[PDB]
Amino acid sequence: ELLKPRTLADLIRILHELFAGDEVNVEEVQAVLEAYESNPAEWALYAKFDQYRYTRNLVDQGNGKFNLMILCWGEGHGSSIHDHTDSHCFLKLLQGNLKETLFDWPDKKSNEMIKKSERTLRENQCAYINDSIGLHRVENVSHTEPAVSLHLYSPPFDTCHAFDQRTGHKNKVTMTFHSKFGIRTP
């Protein structure tokens, strides 16, 4: 059965149990990620801020089944429009809130991308997205507050496309990890 993670350690524990196979029960993953109550002292080692944009901080490589990671968000920090490389994507807020702008995959004309829905992901909630559903932008709308979000991606992926909101054009991007296991990694 799915047990409540009492700490980030206990959450890491269950995740390795959930992905101990070949498929993914997205349902149970989102409930337990949501069930772990964020404890700042437990994940502060991974939340390394960068003044300019957001960064990705690896927390656990999931024995190859997934890359768990934390992405701090300075005031005003946000992403371009992107996809998730045919893999699952879970995003749980550990601190603050984030704006999520949903978009459909562009047709083919060099047309503007109109949002298909938006929402504020709240501190401690866990959302999910995958390519079949559609794309999204992530943005910390705050002017004086930093956000921290815990992401789960399976299978792991480092490359993905960004999409221009005015044309639907796409470009491949190969993301990098700011830190790995509580160590800066230039």
Laid out side by side, the sheet with 126-129 consists of 126-129, 88-95, 147-154, 67-73, 57-60, 179-180
Residues 47, 8: contact at Cβ < 8 Å?
Answer: no
Three-state secondary structure string covering 73-141: ECCCCECCEECCCCCEEEEEEEECCEEEEEECCCCCCCCCCCCCEEEEECECCEEEECCCCCEEEEECC
Cα distance between residue 50 and residue 11, in whole Å: 26
Alpha-carbon Rg for the chain in angstroms:
16
Residues 74, 146: contact at Cβ < 8 Å?
Answer: yes
82 is in an annotated binding site: yes
Phi and psi (nearest 5°) for 136? -160, 165
Cα distance between residue 170 and residue 168, in whole Å: 6
Residues in binding site for Fe cation: 82, 84, 136
Residues in binding site: 82, 84, 136
